[PDB]
Design an enzyme around this catalytic site. Structure first.
Site, PDB file in Angstrom:
ATOM      1  N   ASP A   1      -6.952   7.683  15.082  1.00  0.00           N
ATOM      2  CA  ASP A   1      -7.360   7.551  13.685  1.00  0.00           C
ATOM      3  C   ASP A   1      -7.826   6.131  13.390  1.00  0.00           C
ATOM      4  O   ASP A   1      -7.467   5.553  12.388  1.00  0.00           O
ATOM      5  CB  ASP A   1      -6.208   7.925  12.744  1.00  0.00           C
ATOM      6  CG  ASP A   1      -6.690   8.284  11.344  1.00  0.00           C
ATOM      7  OD1 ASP A   1      -5.858   8.302  10.414  1.00  0.00           O
ATOM      8  OD2 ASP A   1      -7.896   8.563  11.169  1.00  0.00           O
TER       9      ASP A   1
ATOM     10  N   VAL B   1       4.299   1.075   1.852  1.00  0.00           N
ATOM     11  CA  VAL B   1       4.530  -0.089   2.674  1.00  0.00           C
ATOM     12  C   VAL B   1       4.770  -1.252   1.739  1.00  0.00           C
ATOM     13  O   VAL B   1       3.997  -1.478   0.829  1.00  0.00           O
ATOM     14  CB  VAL B   1       3.316  -0.391   3.572  1.00  0.00           C
ATOM     15  CG1 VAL B   1       3.611  -1.595   4.444  1.00  0.00           C
ATOM     16  CG2 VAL B   1       2.986   0.820   4.422  1.00  0.00           C
TER      17      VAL B   1
ATOM     18  N   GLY C   1       0.825  -1.191   0.000  1.00  0.00           N
ATOM     19  CA  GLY C   1       0.000   0.000   0.000  1.00  0.00           C
ATOM     20  C   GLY C   1       0.862   1.245   0.000  1.00  0.00           C
ATOM     21  O   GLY C   1       2.006   1.202   0.410  1.00  0.00           O
TER      22      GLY C   1
ATOM     23  N   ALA D   1       0.481   9.184   1.741  1.00  0.00           N
ATOM     24  CA  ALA D   1       1.023  10.526   1.771  1.00  0.00           C
ATOM     25  C   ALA D   1       2.158  10.721   2.762  1.00  0.00           C
ATOM     26  O   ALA D   1       2.085  11.564   3.636  1.00  0.00           O
ATOM     27  CB  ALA D   1      -0.095  11.518   2.071  1.00  0.00           C
ATOM     28  N   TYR D   2       3.196   9.917   2.614  1.00  0.00           N
ATOM     29  CA  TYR D   2       4.393   9.995   3.440  1.00  0.00           C
ATOM     30  C   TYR D   2       5.357   8.888   3.062  1.00  0.00           C
ATOM     31  O   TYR D   2       6.551   9.120   2.875  1.00  0.00           O
ATOM     32  CB  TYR D   2       4.095   9.953   4.958  1.00  0.00           C
ATOM     33  N   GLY D   3       4.823   7.686   2.917  1.00  0.00           N
ATOM     34  CA  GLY D   3       5.652   6.566   2.545  1.00  0.00           C
ATOM     35  C   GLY D   3       4.856   5.511   1.807  1.00  0.00           C
ATOM     36  O   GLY D   3       3.708   5.715   1.429  1.00  0.00           O
TER      37      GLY D   3
HETATM   38  O1  306 Z   1       0.846  -6.395   6.443  1.00  0.00           O
HETATM   39  C1  306 Z   1       0.753  -5.175   6.543  1.00  0.00           C
HETATM   40  N1  306 Z   1       1.388  -4.580   7.599  1.00  0.00           N
HETATM   41  C2  306 Z   1       1.410  -3.215   7.770  1.00  0.00           C
HETATM   42  C3  306 Z   1       2.065  -2.742   8.938  1.00  0.00           C
HETATM   43  C4  306 Z   1       2.003  -1.339   9.152  1.00  0.00           C
HETATM   44  C5  306 Z   1       1.365  -0.423   8.208  1.00  0.00           C
HETATM   45  C6  306 Z   1       1.433   1.062   8.480  1.00  0.00           C
HETATM   46  C7  306 Z   1       0.915   2.120   7.693  1.00  0.00           C
HETATM   47  N2  306 Z   1       1.346   3.312   8.162  1.00  0.00           N
HETATM   48  N3  306 Z   1       1.966   3.096   9.353  1.00  0.00           N
HETATM   49  C8  306 Z   1       2.134   1.751   9.495  1.00  0.00           C
HETATM   50  C9  306 Z   1       0.704  -0.947   7.021  1.00  0.00           C
HETATM   51  C10 306 Z   1       0.718  -2.367   6.814  1.00  0.00           C
HETATM   52  C11 306 Z   1       0.001  -2.907   5.750  1.00  0.00           C
HETATM   53  C12 306 Z   1      -0.018  -4.323   5.565  1.00  0.00           C
HETATM   54  C13 306 Z   1      -0.775  -5.024   4.499  1.00  0.00           C
HETATM   55  C14 306 Z   1      -1.524  -4.390   3.466  1.00  0.00           C
HETATM   56  C15 306 Z   1      -2.044  -5.392   2.659  1.00  0.00           C
HETATM   57  C16 306 Z   1      -2.823  -5.391   1.442  1.00  0.00           C
HETATM   58  C17 306 Z   1      -3.154  -6.666   0.806  1.00  0.00           C
HETATM   59  C18 306 Z   1      -3.862  -6.621  -0.541  1.00  0.00           C
HETATM   60  N4  306 Z   1      -2.970  -6.937  -1.689  1.00  0.00           N
HETATM   61  C19 306 Z   1      -1.643  -6.314  -1.505  1.00  0.00           C
HETATM   62  C20 306 Z   1      -0.671  -6.696  -2.619  1.00  0.00           C
HETATM   63  C21 306 Z   1      -1.232  -6.217  -3.948  1.00  0.00           C
HETATM   64  C22 306 Z   1      -2.592  -6.888  -4.134  1.00  0.00           C
HETATM   65  C23 306 Z   1      -3.546  -6.517  -2.985  1.00  0.00           C
HETATM   66  C24 306 Z   1      -2.752  -7.958   1.382  1.00  0.00           C
HETATM   67  C25 306 Z   1      -1.975  -7.962   2.620  1.00  0.00           C
HETATM   68  C26 306 Z   1      -1.628  -6.690   3.238  1.00  0.00           C
HETATM   69  N5  306 Z   1      -0.903  -6.360   4.368  1.00  0.00           N
END
Ligand code: 306
EC number: 2.7.11.1
Length: 272
Positions: free
Chosen positions: A122, A22, A15, A18-20
């Protein structure tokens, strides 16, 4: 000890924002997966500070960070289930048992955070991640802050959050207690899980949908799709006056909260 174990491969983008961005990082040797938040430093300092003091099954784990010049690398827990946001069907929601289980876990995480004096500020489906077993984990502490230190509560005044999820007092009072705000956002999350839609753009009198709710018009679109038991809980959570709003310990005593609905995770099964 064991060469190459320090190397991580950025396999894909989980994902952006607006900052980084992941990205999913896989260990070269063990193949363990973790999520790496890449923040182009050219907020982050406090986020790391808050993350280092977090350790709970319903809160995204923080493994560490890597300065390296300007690009900041935050190593966080990988939740393969993605965002709760994607588990909510537009205009429908999800099965009540599932929503109850997610709500139970959300409450567990929030109780933990509030217990150590931290308010997220949030809470929304986009920030609630799911692991392999669909266990909910609260993530993104970029807007979080300490509201209790040395057993002394600090009232908040900063405008933080996302309008559809923000409590009304944040928009009409100079200062406000941190906890009822997170409770309200959890109530909006519960509404979204049970109806597949947000009740209002913001909790203000000028917002027609909000005025209708205050007038008990539950025969209108959002609320009409929600069963009486959970709706009675929502009536206690989405109370304008934060001092009269239900607290978490009382939410845990709510009839719907304690209503048996969800079975286990179908572990065994071999008739005859
Ligand atoms: O595991 C995660 N850990 C995490 C830890 C901290 C932050 C975070 C954000 N800002 N501060 C910290 C954000 C995230 C977001 C995560 C994530 C997103 C996602 C999306 C999909 C869908 N698919 C993704 C690949 C492309 C097809 C769709 C499958 C698995 C999955 N896991």
């Amino acid at each position: 000890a064991v060469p190459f174990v320090e190397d991580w491969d950025l396999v894909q983008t989980l994902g952006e924002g607006a900052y980084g961005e992941v990205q999913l990082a896989v260990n070269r040797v063990t193949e363990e997966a973790v999520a790496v938040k890449i923040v182009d430093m050219k907020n982050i300092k406090k986020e790391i500070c808050i993350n280092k003091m977090l350790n709970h099954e319903n809160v995204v784990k923080f493994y560490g960070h890597r300065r390296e010049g300007n690009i900041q690398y935050l190593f966080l827990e990988y939740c393969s289930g993605g965002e709760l946001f994607d588990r909510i069907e537009p205009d429908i929601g999800m099965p009540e048992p599932d929503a109850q289980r997610f709500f139970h876990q959300l409450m567990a995480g929030v109780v933990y955070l509030h217990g150590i004096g931290i308010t997220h500020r949030d809470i929304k489906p986009e920030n609630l991640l799911l692991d392999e077993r669909d266990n909910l984990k609260i993530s993104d502490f970029g807007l979080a802050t300490v509201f209790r230190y040395n057993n002394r509560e600090r009232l908040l005044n900063k405008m933080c959050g996302t309008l559809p999820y923000v409590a009304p007092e944040l928009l009409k009072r100079r200062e406000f207690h941190a906890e009822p705000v997170d409770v309200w956002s959890c109530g909006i999350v519960l509404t979204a899980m049970l109806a597949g839609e947000l009740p209002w753009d913001q909790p203000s009198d000028s917002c027609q949908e909000y005025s209708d709710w205050k007038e008990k018009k539950t025969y209108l679109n959002p609320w009409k799709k929600i069963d009486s038991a959970p709706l009675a809980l929502l009536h206690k959570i989405l109370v304008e006056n934060p001092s009269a709003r239900i607290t978490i310990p009382d939410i845990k005593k709510d009839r719907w909260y304690n209503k048996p609905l969800k079975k286990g995770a179908k572990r065994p099964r071999v008739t005859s």
